[PDB]
Amino acid sequence: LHKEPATLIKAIDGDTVKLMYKGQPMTFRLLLVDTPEFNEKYGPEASAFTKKMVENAKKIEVEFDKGQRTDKYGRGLAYIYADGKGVNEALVRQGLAKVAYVYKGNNTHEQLLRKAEAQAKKEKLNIWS
């Protein structure tokens, strides 16, 4: 897998963000994580977490996995990094997302994410409290 540069346009919720990617705006859905929807418990906190992480980044990068690269709604399915730090793992490690089902072969960081989630859970942090 490789990282490509992107520019934040706007953070949308805990697991979706609008980026300028190759000179065009695109909605990205973060791979392998499910944050609560904004009107669910921890939904606002997950939204606020992702927003601060991407807005405060000097550099955003997107990294597609080896599977299907867009969902049926036109969203890019990727790992997103802010100054070299994965947003996906950060949310799971913070207990603000659960690890999602693998979608269409995009599984590269699945074990790493499960490990972060198991630690959040052991710490009864946020969603796990």
From Swiss-Prot:
| Cellular location(s) | Secreted
**Basic and acidic residues bias: start-end ranges:** 109-125
Give the active-site positions: R29, E37, R75
Region spans: Disordered = 109-129
* Sequence positions that bind Ca(2+): D15, D34, T35
**Protein name per the record:** Nuclease A
Tell which residues of the whole protein are contained here: 89 to 223 of 231
